[PDB]
Design a protein around this ligand. Sequence first.
Ligand code: TB
Ligand code: TB
Ligand code: TB
Ligand code: TB
Length: 279
Amino acid sequence: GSWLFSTCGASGRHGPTQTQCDGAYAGTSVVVTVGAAGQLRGVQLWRVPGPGQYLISAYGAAGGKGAKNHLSRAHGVFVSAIFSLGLGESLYILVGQQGEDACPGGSPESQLVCLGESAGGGGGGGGATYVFRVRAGELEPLLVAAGGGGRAYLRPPGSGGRGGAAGGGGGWTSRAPSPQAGRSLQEGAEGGQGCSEAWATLGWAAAGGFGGGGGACTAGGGGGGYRGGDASETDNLWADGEDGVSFIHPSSELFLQPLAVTENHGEVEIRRHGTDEVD
Ligand SMILES: [Tb+3]
Ligand SMILES: [Tb+3]
Ligand SMILES: [Tb+3]
Ligand SMILES: [Tb+3]
């Protein structure tokens, strides 16, 4: 009795298609309906197979590396909690995608930065992983596992993160103030675009990951979350984006200490497990 959810092979600022998830889940226990457009595009709808308690373990996505800030990515957050789910219930699962790395570059000029032949150079914020339901016509969050902030170019309320040229992360209910800000869950949670100044300078810029990651500029993008991580408001050369803020519903039982462990894309595992168990 275990169900594993992934990005279905999708990466970048946009979530997976139905065909991608059908392929990824072929031969597995999982069937999902993927939103095709609007606020739920790329979100995976899973029918709960029966009533009872379930352990939901979610991993938000890592942030991207910066062109000269690459010794490690900011890892996404792991959050795990027990929920009572209903006969007939359906869960919406948005699996966060990694913030884009600055290297290799997506244009000749950005790649020259990556080869030392040089706004720009930052990594995008990672998307958060969201698990939620609809109750009485409203979205109800169950668990949000935050994404990691993107690295800056150089190494020395469900609100959105602050930012500017580098985008803050999207939150649960934030409004995006710019194209670089990560979209909120209510808005469909696409990653922010890289900043226009870097697109103009280098011909490409790293985007935030699906799940509310902010776009890079020189500073790194903020991670998605229940609250989005802040990014620099001045495109500072050394300012990594902040990770997002995670969430568990007040009625659930947090099972394990949250940890920053996700290496690349997010994931969710669900299994039958409850407070009837001692461990
Ligand atoms: Tb902050
Ligand atoms: Tb694994
Ligand atoms: Tb049992
Ligand atoms: Tb038993």
